[PDB]
Amino acid sequence: INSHKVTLPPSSSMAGAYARVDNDRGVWKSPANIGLNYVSKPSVTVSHEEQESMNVHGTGKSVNAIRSFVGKGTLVWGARTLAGNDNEWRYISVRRFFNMAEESIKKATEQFVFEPNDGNTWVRVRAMIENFLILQWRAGALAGAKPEHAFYVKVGLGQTMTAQDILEGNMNVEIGLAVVRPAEFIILKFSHKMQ
Amino acid sequence: EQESMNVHGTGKSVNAIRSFVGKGTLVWGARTLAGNDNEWRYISVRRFFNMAEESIKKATEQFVFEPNDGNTWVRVRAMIENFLILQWRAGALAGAKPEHAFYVKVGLGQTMTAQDILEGNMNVEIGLAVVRPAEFIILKFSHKMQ
Amino acid sequence: INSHKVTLPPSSSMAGAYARVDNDRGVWKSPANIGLNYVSKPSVTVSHEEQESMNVHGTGKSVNAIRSFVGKGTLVWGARTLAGNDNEWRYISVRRFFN
Amino acid sequence: LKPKRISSLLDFTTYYGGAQNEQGITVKLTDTLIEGAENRTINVPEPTFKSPYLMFYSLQMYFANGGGPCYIVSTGVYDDWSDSETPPTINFSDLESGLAVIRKEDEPTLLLFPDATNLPTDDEFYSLYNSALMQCNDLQDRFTILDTYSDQTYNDGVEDLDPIPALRNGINLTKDYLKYGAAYYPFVQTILNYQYSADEIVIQHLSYNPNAIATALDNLNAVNGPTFIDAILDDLRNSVKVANFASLVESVLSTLNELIDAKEEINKDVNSAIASSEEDNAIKTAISDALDVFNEDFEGADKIESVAKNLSDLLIKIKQADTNTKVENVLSINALNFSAEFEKLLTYDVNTGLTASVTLDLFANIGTRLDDIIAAVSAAEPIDVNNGKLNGRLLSDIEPLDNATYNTILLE
Amino acid sequence: ATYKTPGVYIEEITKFPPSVAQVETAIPAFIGYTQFARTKPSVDSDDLI
DSSP, rough: TTTTTOOOOOOHHHHHEEEEEEEETTTTSSSSSETTOOOOOOOSSSOOOHHHHHHHHSSOOOOEEEEEETTEEEEEOBOOOTTTTTTTTBBBBHHHHHHHHHHHHHTTTGGGGGGGOSSHHHHHHHHHHHHHHHHHHHHSSSSSSSHHHHHHESSSTTTOOOOOHHHHTTOOEEEEOOOOOOOEEEEEEEEEEOO | OHHHHOOOOOOOOOOEEEEETEEEEEEEBBSSSTTOOTOOOHHHHHHHHHHHHHHHHHHGGGGSBBBBBHHHHHHHHHHHHHHHHHHHHHBOOOOOOOOHHHEEESSBBBOOHHHHHHHHEEEEEEEEEBBBOOOOOOOOOOOOOO | TTTOOOOOOOOHHHHHHHHHHHHHTTTSSSSOOOEEOOOOOOSSSSOOOSSSHSSSSSSOOOOOOEEEETTEEEEEOOOOOOOOOOOOTOOOHHHHHHH | OOEEOOHHHHHHHHOOOOOOOOSOOEEEEEEEEEEEEEEEEEOOOOSOOOOOOHHHHHHHHHTTTTTTOOEEOOOOOOOOSSSBBBBBOOOOOHHHHHHHHHTTTTTTTTEEEETTTGOOSSHHHHHHHHHHHHHHHHHHHOOOEESSSSSSOEESSSSEHHHHHHHHOOOOHHHHHHTTTTEESOOOOOOOOOOOOOGGGGEEOOOOOOOHHHHHHHHHHHSSTTTTTTHHHHHHHHHHHHHHHHHEEEEEEHHHHHHHHHHHHHHHHHHHHHTOOOSSHHHHHHHHHHHHHHIIIIISSSSSHHHHHHHHHHHHHHHHHGGTTTHHHHIIISHHHHHHHHGGTTTSGGGGSOOOOOOSSSSOOOOHHHHHHHHHHTTSSOOOOSBOOOTTTTTTGGGTTOOOHHHHHHHO | OOOOOOOOEEEEEOOSOOHHHOOSOOOOOOOOOOSSOSSSSSSSOOOOO
C-alpha cells in the first residue's frame, strides 16, 4: 500500500523556496538555479529544445520549467513573469523588490499628511527616503559605483509642484531606481591571437 | 608522392605512415582535413581548444541566475585568468610574459551595453596564443670572412 | 535486389540544407557552395557552358543547378529566386530575411 | 544498444566475447617419390574469403599501443556463414543507429567505426563519415578519425578509382565541418593470428599408397563385434528410496552414452570413405544412402539423443525436490515427463520379469544397418587410386593418430 | 546567434586569413604513337588508346 506516492502541482513547493531564498540572499535575487526538497522527479520530461517556446514567445506569456540535469538533480530553471517581453517587468525579483520598497515608503509617509507644505517639510521628506535607499545600494540591490548613479529623489516648488498645486493641497515626490537584473544567458567568445 | 598528400589545392590533407632506415615504421603527418586554414590546420591546436572550452563551460553554470553587476564580473574574470596561467606555465601557450599569451574581457562598456543588461546577457571575450609545431626545418649555410 | 537505388526530386534535401545553414550562419547567408548528404551523383551532367542560360535569362526566371566538381563532390551552385533580374528581390537570402 | 564503459581487454571478453572463427581455410597433403626418396608437401594458401568483423582485433591494437578506458556500443551480433565462400554482410542502418545513441553520452571524445571498410558500396562509407562530422559540429566537443575505403585501386561497378582522390570526392562539406576530422593512409600488417576452430578443418590427402578404404574398413569391422556393440544392447534389455532410485537411472544413462559415443566414431569412418571415392558416383550414392538409414533412430526416427539429455536434468530435479514435498517426487515420476521418457525404448516390457511384448523397440536395428554399410563400402576399395590415410578427416581428430603431422599443420 | 533557453553558450570568431597553396610548374604531356598501350601488360588489349 505504501509503495504508491502522491503527485502534486508545484505551486506550494515554490512558495517555500521563495521564503528560503529571501532569507538567505534577499528579495532581489532570482528564485532559479535552485533545488526542491521531498521531490523524486518531475512528472513530464522537458528537453532543451522544447523549453525555448516556453521561455520566449510572441505573446510574451512565459512559463517556467522544472527540469532534471545529470549530476545535479531536479532544479527550477526559469524566473520570468507573464509579462515576459517587458523591459521593466519581465523578472520576478524586480517586481517583488518594487512591491517591498513602495509599501515601506508609503507607511512611513502617513505621519506627514496634514503637515505644513513648505520648504521645511520638503527637506526632511527627501532625507528620509534618501537614507532608506542608501542602505539598499550598500546591500547590493541597486547597481552603481556611486549613490547618484543608483537613484534620485526630487520634491519641491519649481521642481515637482506649481503654486496652484499648493493651494489645492498637493505634494508631489518623484523617485527613480536602477535595480539589478539577473544574468540569464552567458556567451563565451573564443578567438586566436597572434604570437 | 607524400607531397600531394600533405599539401593540396583542396586543402584536404592525408597523413602518411612510412618506413625509414634505422628508425622503423613511423607516423609522419599531423594535419586535419582543413589543411590550408591558418587557425585550424593542426590536430593538436584543435584538440586543445576542445579541452579548454569544455572545462570553462562546466565551471560557468554556477553563475547563470547570479546578479549581473560589477561584483560578479570581477570574480568571473579571475576564475578564467587563474586557469589560463597554469596552461602558460605548462608550455601550451607561447609568451615571455602572461599578457603576451592571453587576454580576458568582461564588463559594461567593454563587452556589453545597458540594453544588454535588461535582456539578461553577459558577454565574455577570450583570446589565445597556442603553440604550433615545427614541421619544416631549413638550415642555411654561408661563408664568412676571416 | 538491393543494388537498385531510388532517384528523387531535390526539393526535400534542399529544405534540410535551409535549416542547417540558418542554424550555423543565420538566415542572411545564401544557401549555396554547400554539400548534400546521402547523394551519390546528380542524374544529369550540367557543364559550365549550359548553366549560363540557367542563371541569367531574358525572362528573369532563373534555375539553380546541382553540379559536380573534381576534388569537391556534389554541390549546390546557385542562389537565385524566380525574379532573377530584380535589384531588390533576386537573392533567396534577402527575401527570407525580410520575411 | 546501450553504451558501456570498460577498462581492459579482459573486461571486453567477459561481456562481449571474442572474434568469429574463420570458415575459409583449406589444407592439402601430397606424398611423392623422387628417385626412391620420399617427399611430403603441405600447402595452406591464404584465404580469399574472410570474416567481415574486425572489432576484437582493433581492440587488441588499441591496448597494445597505450590505450586506457573506452566506451563500447554494440550494434548487433554475428551472423552465420551460408557456406564456405559466402561470408555475412554489414548493414548501413545498424551503424547509423549506433551513432544516434552515442549523441546522448557526455564523456567520449573520439568516434570510430571498426567494421566500416567492409560496407557494400563506397557511397555508404562516405555518407556514414559525413554524419559523424555533423555530430562533431553540433556537440562541438569531439573529434573523428577516418580511413580510406581501400588501400589499393578498387572497382566501383562502372570505373576503377584510386583511394586518395575518391576520399576527397566523398567528403563534401565546408571547413566548419572538416576541422573536426583527420585521415590516415595506408593499411598496417600486424603480428596477430586469425581465430579458428580445429573441429571445422577438413584434410584432403593424396598419397601413392592408397589405404583410405582399408583403414575405414578396419575400424568398422572392429566395432561390429560381440564384445563391442552387442554388449551395449543386452544390458539395456523417503530419502532412502530416492537415493536408491537414482543409482538405477545412472546405470541406464551410462549405457546410453557409450552407444552415442559409438555413433560418433562410425560417422568419421564413413565420411572419409565418401570423400575418397569421387570416382564412380553410383558407389558414393550407395555409401551415402546406407549412412542416413543407420542415422534414423539416433536423430530422425526416434529421440535417442534427446532422451539422454532430459533424463539428466530430470535426475538433478529429483535430488533437490526432497527438501519439501513428496508429491513433487510423485508428480514427476508418474504423471509428468519421467514415466513417459522410459517408454520410447521399451513400451510394455513390464509384462514379465524379462522384456517381452515388444511393441516399440529403438534398438536391434543397429547390426542390420551396420553390415549393410560394410558391404557398401566394400565396393569402394577397387575404385580409389589416389587417396591416403587422413583424407576427409577433421584436424582435431588426427592428433591421437599422427601427432607430428598435426603439429606441422598448425605452424603453416 | 539567438538564445531562448537559459545557460552557457560557446561561440568561435574567425580572424586569421587562410593561406595559398602553390601549384607545380613543369609537368609536360607527350602526344603520339606507341607500341601497345595496355593497362595490364600480360592481357593483350589496347584499352589505353
